[PDB]
């Protein structure tokens, strides 16, 4: 029979329903991520003839480092805060600190967070 | 007064309203805290890195935060008609993008602690106003020249 067992576990995520031991053919389950994690892939998985479709992933947020910002002579735009949690897929906006100009390629002041990884711009003494 | 009229003759209603807006923020003492924080933060960097003692000693003194119409007109004259119109036009776009809720920056992580668009609009407006004020009084005080004012404020006004 085209019956599946329990749907697969995913790091920092879980299914929206209570976990059953056996699943009927063409039955489906949906996933959710932990608070600051971002779902990447399809939200739903289906039991297709004894096998589940590919589960999504829950990608890590980026933690904006005060020390990196100080070493690169940058600051967060729009805020006085030097601490920020950025989700995967979101853009982070920076500015050069006063007395510094951009030394990295243009458009590096606006950059995307991806699974805990962020490329910080660099500024150098004017 | 001739050069000032020679600039105003080249400005549309959008640029003229941005001029009224900028001048209005320069007359608002509520932004003085922003200038003192910027002053302290800039002096602390120079002290830490043991750089430019002449500038540090000027930064230990009190900055002038008084508005004067002649000094305002001198900044516009030193920028020249072209840069002054580019600056007022970009100020218009920034303010319109905040008003319309279309400012791309609104989708950034930088605003993701805020629950609604009105809060986002308020953060953006209060930050732009503080930057217009800080940049003008750093110029008035001789820490930056007209060209530095232009390039620095255009970074903050980018949409």
Numbering used by the authors:
A (entry chain B): 1106 to 1231
B (entry chain A): 44 to 202
What do the authors say?
Important mechanism for complement evasion is acquisition of the main host complement inhibitor, factor H (FH). The main AP regulator in serum is Factor H (FH), which consists of 20 globular short consensus repeat domains called SCR or FH-domains. Binding of FH has also been described for RF agents, and a ligand for FH in B. hermsii was shown by Hovis et al. to be a plasmid-encoded, surface-exposed Factor H binding protein A (FhbA). By determining the 2.2 Å crystal structure of Factor H binding protein A (FhbA) from Borrelia hermsii in complex with FH domains 19–20, combined with extensive mutagenesis, we identified the structural mechanism by which B. hermsii utilizes FhbA in immune evasion.
The structure of BhFhbA (residues 44–202) reveals a compact, single-domain fold, which is composed solely of a bundle of nine α-helices. The first five α-helices (α1-α5) wrap around the core formed by α-helices 6–9 with the overall architecture of the fold resembling a curved arc or capital letter ‘L’. The structure of BhFhbA is thus a previously uncharacterized fold and further represents a novel FH-binding scaffold. The primary and biologically relevant interface in the FH20 domain has a buried surface area of 1066 Å2, as determined by the PISA server. Within the cavity, Trp1183 of FH20 surrounded by a sandwich like stack of aromatic residues sits between two BhFhbA residues: Phe154 from the hinge region and Tyr170 from helix α8. This tightly constrained binding pocket is further coordinated by the hydrophobic sidechains of α6 Met137 and Leu146 and α8 Ile171. Moreover, towards the C-terminus of FH20, Tyr199 from BhFhbA α9 forms van der Waals interactions with FH20 Val1200, with the closest approach being 3.8 Å. The structure, combined with mutagenesis and binding studies, led to the identification of a conserved aromatic residue, Phe154, that is central in binding FH. However, the interactions are different: a hydrophobic binding pocket is formed between FH20 and BhFhbA, whereas the FH20:OspE interaction is mainly electrostatic in nature and mediated by hydrogen bonds.
